[PDB]
Design a protein around this nucleic acid. Structure first.
Lengths: 94, 116, 177, 69
RNA sequence: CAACCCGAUGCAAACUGCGAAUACCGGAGAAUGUUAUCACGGGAGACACACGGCGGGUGCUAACGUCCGUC
RNA sequence: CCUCCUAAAGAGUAACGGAGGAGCACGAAGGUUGGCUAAUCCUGGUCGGACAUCAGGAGGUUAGUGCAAUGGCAUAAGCCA
RNA sequence: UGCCUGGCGGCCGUAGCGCGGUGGUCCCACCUGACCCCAUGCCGAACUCAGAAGUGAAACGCCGUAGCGCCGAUGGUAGUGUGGGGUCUCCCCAUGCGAGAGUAGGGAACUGCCAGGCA
């Protein structure tokens, strides 16, 4: 029922994370199962609008990446110390 | 505990002999049975071993464990070792007291034609 | 021996019957007895310690070993390595005969005999109490009595629970609390 | 005076008999094969070869060993 | 009102269950460098250095202050 | 003379910069062989005040390891013969 | 040789701790006496002399339990070498190396030699 937009990820490192954050975006990861964990790039404001929902804590997220629908869940979220910005997120293929 | 104390007492000689790196004959004792082996310098291989529980050496013994049994086991170990060609092993009494059956078997091994 | 055979004959039978034990040796078995003398006045004089040790040796089958200081405390003014008392470690025929002789006559003939305590246990079935007026014992005659002195009596048993101590007291018939 | 401390010779470095590997005030390392501890808790080689460091024991004690060439 | 005490709540130039990058030492390897490396011998000169960047001691985390290791 | 910082995960590295001990000692407090293993709390205890020592449980070196300190010491470098 | 048990190495909290269960075929443990091998700062305390009297109980071997505890990614974060910029107490930029904690996941370990019994 919930819509999610995802884009491929190809760069790794602190510099890459800085570039993503400066571009009004940020990275996230999906891990779990025998399938290889992988990173996915997400934007900042639209993903914040998604996370604003209060039912996220008990909802399975439907990631649409590379024309494929994957059911995952976010066990942990990395949040900026005090500023209201998200720099990284964790997901598991539930 | 008794086994732990015996092992830790033996540990001194057990670790000291490793630096020397020579073949070592050890004997484990128990009123029920007496076992013996000739461990190689690596500490994981043995050229010969005997056990009173096995009848091959306990057929002539009135019981598996006794002073005569220890002497016979020591003699058998020494003669098997001599025929195998140990070439001057060293001695280790499994951290026991050298006053009884261990002493008897050690003397039997010495008189069997050994030089330790 | 004299008490050991009777113990194995009847105490073991009653204990196994009441505790429906399956193993033969699950019934409690006594390890030893300890008869210590921790008066604490030995600092005042050393001759009293020697006399009490001789008395313990006479009553028992062996001479007690002396016990030295454990930890010094400034307040009480006690040093290290200074003997204060001694203990007899009764084991074997000696403990058997001594305990038999005690339980025969000594225990019944005590003033203010309110009965021994069955709740006072260390926590693993060892009964360790203290009793004064050593004159209760027969071996301490008026000829050799020096002063009314206390003692500590403990029974060391292979049991690991207080139920076993209670069962042993029942076997001894435990006159009353 | 500033007394010298530290590992004189590290792992993988050739040593000769009578050469001190690590001069330590206490016992932070223990001799293994062809290594000896002096009266002053100094580790010295008893042969010629390469030096190696390992960790073993109940307390994860560090052992210095020597392998001949 | 308040010890020991569970959660903690702050600090440690002489705290570490854990724990970097740099700096030092050993081995192997392509490449470049007029051997740029070491030993011996002859000859010296200098023996109040100044300023600035980097991370600090100190000063009142005021001063073009004070002293460190490196450049 | 020695121990710890300033002193920047090698050593060393300055200030009338920052904190401390000693001129010792053993013929046993050394060696060898065989054995053993703390401070700390609770339980009962004429004397016992919680704070002489005593028998049992845990604890696992916070004890001790001669001097001030540092690093090590349980295989003990600590204790007995 | 398939299993249980014991001895000799490695590895040193994946081997550890708590809890439930199982074990005497072999092995191991338990026992009295000890005047004899050996000894008590008393004690047969420990070791040693006889073996099973019988048991598998304290202890010990083993199975289950992911309870405690332990190990622990990818990623991200703090940090930092190099050159530069700024509003130069400190931050950022391009670039290289990268934490710890925690998540996923792992696991009730595994392994070399010899001996007894159960086939």
């Amino acid at each position: 029922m919930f819509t999610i937009n995802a884009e491929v990820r190809k760069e790794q490192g602190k510099g890459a994370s800085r570039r993503l954050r400066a571009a009004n975006k940020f990275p996230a990861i999906i891990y779990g199962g025998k399938e290889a964990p992988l990173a996915i790039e997400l934007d900042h404001d639209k993903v914040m609008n998604m996370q604003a929902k209060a039912e996220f804590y008990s909802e399975v997220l439907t990631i649409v990446v590379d024309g494929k629908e994957i059911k995952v869940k976010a066990q942990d979220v990395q949040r900026h110390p005090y500023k209201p910005k998200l720099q990284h997120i964790d997901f598991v293929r539930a | 505990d008794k086994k732990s104390a015996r092992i830790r007492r033996a540990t001194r000689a057990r670790r000291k002999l490793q630096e020397l790196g020579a073949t070592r004959l050890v004997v484990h004792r128990t009123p029920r049975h007496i076992y013996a082996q000739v461990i190689a310098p690596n500490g994981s291989e043995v050229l010969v071993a005997a056990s009173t529980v096995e009848k091959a050496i306990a057929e002539q013994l009135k019981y598996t464990g006794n002073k005569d049994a220890a002497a016979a086991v020591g003699k058998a170990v020494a003669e098997r070792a001599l025929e195998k060609g140990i070439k001057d092993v060293s001695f280790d009494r499994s951290g026991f007291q050298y006053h009884g059956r261990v002493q008897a078997l050690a003397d039997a091994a010495r008189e069997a034609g050994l030089q330790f | 021996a004299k008490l050991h055979d009777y113990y194995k004959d009847e105490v073991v039978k009653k204990l196994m019957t009441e505790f429906n034990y399956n193993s033969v040796m699950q019934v409690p078995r006594v390890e030893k007895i300890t008869l210590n003398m921790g008066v604490g006045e030995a600092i005042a004089d050393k001759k009293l310690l020697d006399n009490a040790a001789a008395d313990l040796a006479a009553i028992s089958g062996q001479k007690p070993l002396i016990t030295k200081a454990r930890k010094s405390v400034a307040g009480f003014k006690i040093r290290q390595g200074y003997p204060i008392g001694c203990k007899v470690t009764l084991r074997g025929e000696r403990m058997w005969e001594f305990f038999e002789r005690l339980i025969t006559i000594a225990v019944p003939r005590i003033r203010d005999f309110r009965g021994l305590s069955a709740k006072s246990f260390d926590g693993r079935g060892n009964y360790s109490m203290g009793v004064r007026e050593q004159i209760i014992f027969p071996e301490i005659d008026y000829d050799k009595v020096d002063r009314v002195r206390g003692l500590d009596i403990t029974i060391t048993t292979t049991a690991k629970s207080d139920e076993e101590g209670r069962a042993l007291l029942a076997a001894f018939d435990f006159p009353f609390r | 005076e500033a007394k010298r401390l530290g590992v004189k010779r590290f792992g993988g470095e050739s040593v000769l008999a009578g050469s001190i590997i690590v001069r330590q005030r206490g016992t932070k390392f223990h001799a293994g094969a062809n290594v000896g501890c002096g009266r002053d808790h100094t580790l010295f080689a008893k042969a010629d070869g390469k030096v190696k460091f390992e960790v073993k024991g109940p307390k994860n004690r560090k052992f210095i060993s020597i392998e001949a060439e």
